[PDB]
Design a protein around this ligand. Structure first.
Ligand SMILES: CCCCCCCCCCCCCCCCCC(=O)OC[C@H](COP(=O)([O-])OCC(O)COP(=O)([O-])OC[C@@H](COC(=O)CCCCCCCCCCCCCCCCC)OC(=O)CCCCCCCCCCCCCCCCC)OC(=O)CCCCCCCCCCCCCCCCC
Ligand SMILES: CCCCCCCCCCCCCCCCCC(=O)OC[C@H](COP(=O)([O-])OCC(O)COP(=O)([O-])OC[C@@H](COC(=O)CCCCCCCCCCCCCCCCC)OC(=O)CCCCCCCCCCCCCCCCC)OC(=O)CCCCCCCCCCCCCCCCC
Ligand SMILES: CCCCCCCCCCCCCCCCCC(=O)OC[C@H](COP(=O)([O-])OCC(O)COP(=O)([O-])OC[C@@H](COC(=O)CCCCCCCCCCCCCCCCC)OC(=O)CCCCCCCCCCCCCCCCC)OC(=O)CCCCCCCCCCCCCCCCC
Ligand SMILES: [Zn+2]
Lengths: 40, 192, 35, 485, 456
């Protein structure tokens, strides 16, 4: 917002949301899908 | 010329968005796709009777009783650490303002004692929207400032005047501008 | 540091924190000068 | 004779076709479509870059005034001189001489609220848009008029007519804007404390017409900050801001577009309804007043009333006499007979201020503060011998005044305000040729015939600064009496 | 599709092209005549513009140029002083003159029927003035009093001292009035030597505007200026980076400052861009403000200044650009409180340094709008037009029509401004002058290292 000094927490917000999307994608690939393809 | 070319990309996209503008109010497109609307509409008779109905009734019972114990209204739950509501409170008239002050005092004292009020003190509706006309005005006023001033990432002088320089307008609200003085008696921003 | 009769300012604009030491040591230019 | 106004009828149109006539306007620049850059890079400025396509064969515009009227009452006047920048102005017949004991200060409040929030625009958006178009705009209060005006390229006129008319059509007067704008009511006078000349002007006015009409102050006093509530402002506006009390004037715009965009402004809405107001005649009191302060001169002024003011027939006599005496040259009566014969005067001047139905005319001087009693004697002699004139000076003055008349109207803003002010004052514009024909007719006798009438009411006397040696009221009036005034 | 995309678009109005012509002609002796006729005016302006000033004094007689400006009104071979003054006044006309570092100007206003007489008078006082020694020895009183008064107008002394400290090695340094001892030592032979070295036909142009006909004016000039004599390498002035500070604590709380950079000549291609940069930085006054509060203004420099310490740190500031025949100056002037001076100055330096890194097209277009309003808004009266004719005739050898100026201004975008600034202003030398309570004042090296940012 205009007239405010908080400028570094928004960046961390976007980075964190990014990182969680990342982690969940990789976890689905690692723990579920790759084994599943051995059971498919 | 890299910059002017990417300019061209941005400009064409903006012109597309501009060309599709309506000239009058048009109802918003639904919030959910047709698949989920179909599924909800199918499962309504069970879901609303068994689960959603009682959930939404229990919720209001809980809220009402907690507000009545203390004698608060619902719009007494909003803070003034919220810019929009701070503006709304600035725009209030004397009587509403005084009554809000009084109710907050009483609620603090009652939560300290942890004593219920008599049931004859609890005969009122807590969910009246008494702040609405002022919140809408606050929203208008604070939206226009974003539109007319906040549309770019402005550049400043760093660590000068007690402000970091990246956008703040109140001194020493951030750690790297703490401790403004080493001698003397200090001072306050409100007395400049 | 400086005597109180030297560190009395003519202006009235608030001294910014980063200039503290600058105005604790203010001195008058008796007679003026050119540099 | 009043001008024959052309009618402009109201018509209602499809907005999506009217939107094809709106100028283009941008506030964001999301990228840019043109990539060619500076196409004249490296070309010196003494080497032309025009192609033969951009040459033209010149056709002048026609520059006699055009007069029109909307159906609701609004009068419109326009001229074009083919300049690139236009001048736009709205004139309202709401000065301070129309206030009373319950109203004092309301006009200043309205002026201090110009370009604030209205029905369809906010204050912030309004002023920011005016800034970004590149324009300069403002509002001015007088004793008989209130004026709004703006100025920028002529192609932006359709975007400026709303913002000027808004202020009189539908302001909101939200409390938190009134409250925030209050300090500007006091600074207006706080700055007058270092403008002695203007200060003396105000003293003259309040002493000449004590406590009535033109006498009222142009500012909010402390007593004026009570009735600073929206209902008084709104009730005052309902009595004055009706269309038939207004004029809209434009210079360097095409008249049919001006008429069209003005008509399109009032077509949807109800304007303030008319009122058959009446105005009282000023009562001239005269009198005497002093105000001491460390200034190193004795500032003095003496004045007499002009009966009838701008509506009196002798408007030309006073304006010629002022140039015989010496306006605000070096062969003038005061310059020769005062400034070149006394060592202790810094400046002597004749002043002339006129209003719709009364005025004043007098002399002003700055002197060594030890010799004020001599200053009064000099002024008394001068007043003593205004009655009589010789034809050399009279011809000098008439020629000088003609020159000044013609050369002052070579400037668009002055022309705009002149035309406006005249239309408000008497519903007619006097073209400079007519002013010259009137000047030429002034006789040697008429000067005496006017001054003999000027001296029939008591004087107005003001002193300012180091007044430590100024004679007493009776002494001043006896000095004037001895000199035959 | 949408009506919001159907708006009228006219960057340059048709009136910019439909303007009356400027007519030019060169006489055999080298004198140039220029004219433009304006149907909507009753009077006219006519005068002479001369390509000489104080830059063409010699260091021994510095101040002669300005003395001659007074002498030319003292009497001629044909008419006495009393006769000359009465023949000025009996026309009911105006006559003005002035001189500068590079240019000197005389002009009058009159109705058409009196243009001949005016020309005559002008020629007379330019060609045939009697510089009597017993009148030179009296004008010294008036010139000394004039200098006495000039020292009280602070802005002008600040700019003079900026020129003094910037152009140490060149006659641009010279002040127009000249030193005191030179005013006392001035002598007829010095004045006549200045005349006979600078008043040649190649250096003069005659211009008019209003209700004027080019043919009659050319004939009149041919008739009267037949007696003007005909004419018979130089290097770029060096710009020094230095300060010249007058500390004084007995003149109240306010400090005055001016800062300057090296500019470009009249004829340079980038001149227009410089005219634009001056507008991008703009100006501010705390006393009188229009209708936009400074704290919300679209100009970012004003906005940053007005929000400093919540009270704002300046009384007044204004930028400027000046172009000369072979060089220029570019900078700003300011007034502020003793304790605000530091911020008062460094904010505006940050302003000017932004032009090379971060400016955007919102700002460029705002500045274009304001610049156009200003310049196109002045050129209304006959005097402004005649002055513009003569000024451009001397500066360019021509007059540039409005359409050309607008077309060249239109195509400048942000990247072009950000190129020119990077060419001339980034990491440059600066010159400084100041007066008053300068205890706050920054170092020269501070102002010089300000011209670049270490960020980026
Ligand atoms: C095993 C599996 C699991 C793994 C773990 C997974 C964990 C996931 C969850 C993560 C949780 C959150 C982590 C932190 C996120 C921070 C985000 C952020 O930037 O917030 C902005 C936010 C403010 O943003 P804003 O509101 O936009 O305000 C704008 C202002 O302009 C902003 O200015 P301001 O003045 O208002 O703010 C203060 C300013 C300035 O603050 C200061 O100046 C304070 C300086 C204090 C120094 C004291 C010594 C500290 C030594 C490091 C200790 C690390 C311990 C780690 C724990 C594990 C140990 C094994 O600091 C900042 O802005 C933050 C800078 C970044 C902080 C990073 C902290 C974590 C890493 C640090 C260590 C890096 C590794 C190398 C060194 C390791 C040595 C052991 O700031 C905070 O909330 C920070 C709060 C304080 C916490 C940090 C304190 C330590 C500071 C260290 C600074 C770097 C130097 C390190 C030493 C190097 C030399 C040895
Ligand atoms: C102790 C400090 C030392 C003193 C000096 C200060 C040092 C700081 C210098 C670095 C800053 C350079 C960048 C200049 C930006 C200028 C922009 C501008 O015009 O200003 C207005 C603008 C705010 O105006 P506004 O747009 O109206 O405000 C609305 C909000 O910003 C909300 O806006 P929004 O929601 O619309 O979203 C906007 C957002 C949209 O974009 C995003 O949100 C993108 C998110 C994508 C996720 C990826 C992460 C993005 C962050 C990148 C971090 C990489 C840098 C580190 C590289 C390490 C290399 C070893 O825009 C950006 O993120 C663009 C700016 C991002 C730049 C951040 C990195 C700059 C550092 C470059 C130098 C790196 C060397 C470091 C060396 C190692 C030591 C640290 O300024 C900023 O946004 C500030 C950005 C820079 C961060 C603040 C600087 C830190 C100050 C605290 C010191 C903490 C130190 C802790 C250590 C303690 C030790 C004991
Ligand atoms: C034992 C530990 C000891 C630690 C000691 C550390 C000392 C460092 C001091 C930092 C510098 C001073 C900061 C004051 C800034 C004042 C605030 C301000 O307004 O500034 C505006 C200014 C921006 O300029 P502007 O506003 O555009 O206008 C400027 C004016 O026009 C014209 O400018 P001006 O005339 O106004 O002057 C401005 C001046 C203001 O200062 C002054 O006026 C006073 C002088 C400053 C202090 C000078 C002494 C410091 C000694 C430096 C060497 C320390 C080495 C320590 C190594 C420990 C070994 C055990 O600032 C500077 O010029 C400072 C330049 C030096 C800082 C940059 C160093 C970063 C290089 C990183 C290279 C990558 C290395 C990676 C490998 C790991 C290495 C460990 O801000 C700056 O640029 C200041 C520096 C910002 C920090 C950048 C990021 C730093 C992080 C580096 C990477 C960390 C590596 C760690 C990884 C380890 C791997 C194992
Ligand atoms: Zn002089």
């Amino acid at each position: 917002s205009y007239g405010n000094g908080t400028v570094l927490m928004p960046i961390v917000r976007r980075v964190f949301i990014g990182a969680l999307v990342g982690i969940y994608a990789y976890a689905a690939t690692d723990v579920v899908l790759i084994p599943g393809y051995a059971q498919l | 010329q890299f910059h002017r070319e990417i300019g061209k990309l941005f400009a064409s996209y903006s012109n597309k968005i501009t060309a599709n503008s309506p000239v009058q109010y048009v109802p918003s497109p639904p919030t959910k796709g047709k698949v989920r609307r179909a599924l909800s509409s199918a499962l309504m008779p069970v879901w609303f009777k068994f689960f959603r109905g009682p959930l939404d009734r229990w919720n209001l019972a809980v809220m009402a009783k907690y507000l009545r114990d203390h004698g608060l209204m619902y719009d007494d739950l909003y803070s003034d650490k919220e810019p929009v509501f701070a503006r709304a409170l600035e725009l209030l008239p004397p009587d509403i303002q005084a009554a809000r002050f009084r109710r907050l005092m009483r609620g603090t004292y009652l939560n300290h004692l942890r004593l219920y009020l008599p049931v004859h003190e609890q005969n009122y509706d807590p969910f009246i929207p008494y702040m609405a006309p002022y919140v809408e005005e606050a929203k208008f006023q604070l939206q226009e400032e974003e539109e007319l001033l906040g549309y770019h990432m402005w550049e400043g002088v760093w660590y000068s005047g007690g402000v970091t320089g990246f956008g703040d307008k109140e001194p020493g609200e951030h750690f790297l501008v703490a401790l403004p003085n080493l001698y003397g008696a200090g001072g306050s921003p409100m007395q400049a | 540091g400086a005597p109180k009769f030297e560190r009395k300012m003519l202006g009235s604009y608030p001294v910014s924190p980063e200039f503290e030491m600058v105005w604790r040591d203010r001195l008058t230019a008796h007679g003026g000068y050119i540099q | 004779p009043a001008p024959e106004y052309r009618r402009v009828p109201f018509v209602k149109e499809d907005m999506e076709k009217v939107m094809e006539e709106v100028p283009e306007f941008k506030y964001y620049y999301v990228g840019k479509e043109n990539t060619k850059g500076n196409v004249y890079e490296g070309i010196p400025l003494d080497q032309s870059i025009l192609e033969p396509a951009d040459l033209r064969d010149y056709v002048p515009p026609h520059s006699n005034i055009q007069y029109s009227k909307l159906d609701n009452g609004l009068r419109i006047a326009s001229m074009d001189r083919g300049g690139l920048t236009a001048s736009l102005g709205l004139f309202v017949h709401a000065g301070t001489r129309f206030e009373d004991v319950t109203n004092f200060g309301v006009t200043h409040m309205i002026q201090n609220l110009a370009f604030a929030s209205t029905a369809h625009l906010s204050l912030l958006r309004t002023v920011k848009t005016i800034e970004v178009l590149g324009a300069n705009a403002g509002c001015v209060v007088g004793r008989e008029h209130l004026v709004y005006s703006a100025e920028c390229l002529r192609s932006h006129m359709p975007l400026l007519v709303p913002m000027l008319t808004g202020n009189v059509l539908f302001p909101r007067f939200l409390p938190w804007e009134l409250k925030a704008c209050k300090e500007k009511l006091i600074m207006a006078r706080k700055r007058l404390e270092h403008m002695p000349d203007q200060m003396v002007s105000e003293l003259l006015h309040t002493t000449a017409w004590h406590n009535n009409t033109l006498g009222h102050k142009l500012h909010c006093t402390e007593r004026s900050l009570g009735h600073y509530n929206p209902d008084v402002i709104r009730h005052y506006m309902l009595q004055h801001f009706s269309p038939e009390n207004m004029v809209f004037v434009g210079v360097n715009v095409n008249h049919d577009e001006l008429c069209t965009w003005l008509m399109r402004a009032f077509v949807d809405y109800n304007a303030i309804p008319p009122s058959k107001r009446t105005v009282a005649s000023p009562v001239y009191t005269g009198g005497d007043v002093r105000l001491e302060t460390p200034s190193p001169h004795a500032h003095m002024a003496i004045a007499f009333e002009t009966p009838g003011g701008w509506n009196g027939g002798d408007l030309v006599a006073y304006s010629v006499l002022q140039t015989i005496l010496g306006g605000g040259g070096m062969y003038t009566r005061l310059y020769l007979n005062v400034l070149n014969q006394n060592e202790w005067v810094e400046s002597a001047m004749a002043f002339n201020t006129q209003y719709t139905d009364s005025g004043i005319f007098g002399l002003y001087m700055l002197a060594d503060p030890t010799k004020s009693a001599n200053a009064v004697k000099v002024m008394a002699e001068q007043f003593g011998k205004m009655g009589s004139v010789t034809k050399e000076e009279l011809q000098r003055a008439k020629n000088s005044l003609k020159s000044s008349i013609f050369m002052n109207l070579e400037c668009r803003g002055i022309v705009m305000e002149d035309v406006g002010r005249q239309l408000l004052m008497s519903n007619r514009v006097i073209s400079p040729q007519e002013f010259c024909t009137a000047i030429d007719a002034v006789t040697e006798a008429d000067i005496k015939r006017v001054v003999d009438a000027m001296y029939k009411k008591p004087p107005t006397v003001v002193a300012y600064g180091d007044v430590s040696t100024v004679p007493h009221y009776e002494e001043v009036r006896a000095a004037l009496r001895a000199a035959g005034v | 599709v949408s009506p919001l995309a159907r708006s009228v678009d006219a960057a340059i109005p048709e009136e910019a092209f439909n303007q009356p012509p400027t007519l030019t002609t060169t006489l055999p002796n080298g004198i140039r005549v220029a004219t433009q006729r304006l149907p909507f005016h009753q009077t006219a302006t006519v005068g002479v513009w001369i390509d000489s000033g104080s830059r063409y004094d010699t260091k021994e007689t510095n101040g002669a140029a300005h003395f001659l400006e007074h002498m030319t009104f003292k009497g001629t071979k044909r008419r006495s002083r009393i006769q000359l003054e009465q023949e000025i006044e009996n026309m009911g006309a105006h006559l003005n003159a002035y001189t500068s570092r590079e240019q000197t100007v005389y002009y009058a206003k009159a109705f058409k029927k009196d243009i001949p007489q005016c020309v005559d008078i002008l020629s007379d006082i330019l060609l045939n003035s009697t510089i009597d020694e017993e009148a030179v020895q009296m004008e010294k009183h008036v010139i000394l009093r004039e200098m006495e008064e000039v020292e009280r107008q602070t802005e002008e002394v600040i700019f003079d001292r900026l020129h003094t400290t910037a152009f140490r090695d060149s006659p641009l340094g010279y002040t127009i009035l000249g030193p005191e001892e030179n005013i006392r030592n001035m002598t007829r032979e010095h004045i006549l030597e200045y005349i006979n070295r600078n008043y040649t036909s190649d250096r003069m142009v005659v211009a008019a505007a209003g209700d004027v006909d080019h043919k009659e004016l050319t004939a009149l000039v041919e008739k009267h200026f037949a007696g003007l004599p005909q004419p018979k390498p130089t290097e770029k002035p060096f710009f020094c980076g230095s300060e010249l500070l007058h500390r004084n604590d007995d003149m109240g709380p306010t400090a005055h400052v001016a800062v300057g950079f090296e500019g470009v000549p009249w004829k340079s291609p980038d001149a227009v861009t410089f005219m634009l940069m001056q507008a991008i930085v703009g100006s501010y006054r705390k006393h009188d403000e229009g209708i936009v509060p400074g704290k919300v203004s679209a100009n970012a420099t004003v906005r940053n200044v007005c929000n400093k310490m919540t009270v704002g740190c300046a009384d007044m500031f204004s930028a400027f650009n000046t172009c000369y025949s072979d060089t220029g100056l570019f900078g700003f002037y300011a007034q502020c409180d003793e304790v605000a001076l530091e911020h008062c100055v460094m904010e505006i330096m940050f302003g000017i340094t932004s032009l090379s890194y971060a400016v955007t097209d919102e700002e460029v277009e705002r500045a274009k709008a304001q610049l156009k309003t200003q310049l196109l808004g002045h050129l209304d009266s006959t005097t402004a037009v005649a002055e513009d004719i003569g000024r451009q005739m001397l500066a360019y050898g021509r007059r540039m029509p409005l359409a050309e100026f607008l077309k060249r201004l239109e195509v400048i975008d942000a990247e072009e401004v950000k190129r020119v600034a990077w060419k001339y202003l980034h990491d440059a030398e600066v010159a400084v002058a100041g007066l008053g309570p300068l205890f706050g004042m920054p170092q020269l090296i501070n102002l010089r290292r300000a011209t670049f940012w270490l960020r980026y």
